[PDB]
Design a protein around this ligand. Structure first.
Ligand SMILES: CC(C(=O)SCCNC(=O)CCNC(=O)[C@H](O)C(C)(C)COP(=O)(O)OP(=O)(O)OC[C@H]1O[C@@H](n2cnc3c(N)ncnc32)[C@H](O)[C@@H]1OP(=O)(O)O)=[N+]([O-])[O-]
Ligand SMILES: CC(C(=O)SCCNC(=O)CCNC(=O)[C@H](O)C(C)(C)COP(=O)(O)OP(=O)(O)OC[C@H]1O[C@@H](n2cnc3c(N)ncnc32)[C@H](O)[C@@H]1OP(=O)(O)O)=[N+]([O-])[O-]
Ligand SMILES: [Cl-]
Ligand SMILES: [Cl-]
Ligand SMILES: [Co+2]
Ligand SMILES: [Co+2]
Lengths: 140, 140
């Protein structure tokens, strides 16, 4: 089952500048930073709250590491802003299979590594009324 | 203080069809529906989780009631997808004044009515790295 909003994926041109914006404006602090070279992003997670399923909700700020990447292509076309939304589940493999069986395109055969060792997959935005939708199971 | 992600505002052409998509695909159900004629939207709130500040996190699906509205203009330009993000606070007036004092444009002098009697205001996307950002205090 999808039991929380896990995060909002926000694309930006300069991760350090946009991190500073969220810290200065709202008092949000950095929970974690990492590079995902497969995905072609440098990311920062800002934790906003805990959630009733035992998880948490974050802002995931993403700067592309290369133009030839999902986020690099998207920023070039659209400018900075919301790139995707992510829902948390205790079983991404099972939930992804159930959604594949409804005819919504699941972009990975098998979940891939995401933030903080999580396992993630994506649903095609053109099957989700224009919203790139991620499914995530936390490593813990 | 901004203590939760309150909701994701998602624009759609057909509220009933997009509600059905979220119900069929993810098992989300409708928590509330209402029309906001000032804002020019028909909305449905889908509750995803409760949050550690005592509040909750929703998907807010929005269909325009008129072309000449924030969401009608935006859908015509961009197609369906994420329109805004909303953060919850126990004092929208105080937090909005603190953010106005940082030079981020606050679009209302005074918070206006939002979902379920909430009081809301917005920050200009061009001051927030491309993200239309709402601040909301729940009526309870
Ligand atoms: C590490 C991690 C992350 O979140 S990494 C996040 C970055 N990685 C990802 O996004 C991977 C998944 N995304 C993708 O594979 C691709 O970007 C998509 C789903 C396949 C689209 O790739 P395409 O190469 O087909 O892009 P393309 O520009 O060709 O566009 C294909 C269609 O999708 C639309 N589209 C593309 N990106 C979109 C987005 N982010 N949201 C909504 N619509 C989108 C686009 O406007 C076009 O619509 P249109 O036909 O109406 O004009 N984490 O830890 O949580
Ligand atoms: C009831 C409720 C709701 O949430 S009601 C939600 C619907 N209402 C609202 O959005 C009200 C707040 N929004 C607004 O007043 C306006 O839409 C904005 C902030 C002023 C923009 O209005 P404008 O008439 O200036 O729009 P305009 O198309 O002229 O565009 C002005 C600039 O803002 C950008 N922009 C417009 N809408 C945007 C959005 N949703 N996200 C990001 N960028 C946006 C746009 O791309 C352009 O950038 P560019 O210059 O780089 O091209 N609730 O209960 O929670
Ligand atoms: Cl890596
Ligand atoms: Cl009304
Ligand atoms: Co993500
Ligand atoms: Co809203």
């Amino acid at each position: 089952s999808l039991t929380r909003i896990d995060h909002i994926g926000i694309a930006c041109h300069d991760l350090d500048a946009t991190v500073e914006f969220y810290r200065a404006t709202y008092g949000f602090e950095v929970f974690h930073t990492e590079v995902n070279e497969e995905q072609g992003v440098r990311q920062a997670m800002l934790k906003i709250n805990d959630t009733s399923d035992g998880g948490a909700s974050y802002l995931q700020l993403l700067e592309p590491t290369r133009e030839d990447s999902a986020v690099g292509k998207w920023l070039a076309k659209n400018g900075e802003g919301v790139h995707h939304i992510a829902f948390g589940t205790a079983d991404v493999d099972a939930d992804a299979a159930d959604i594949r069986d409804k005819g919504v395109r699941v972009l990975y055969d098998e979940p891939r590594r995401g933030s903080m060792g999580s396992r993630i997959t994506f649903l095609h935005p053109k099957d989700c009324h224009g919203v790139l939708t991620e499914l995530v199971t936390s490593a813990a």
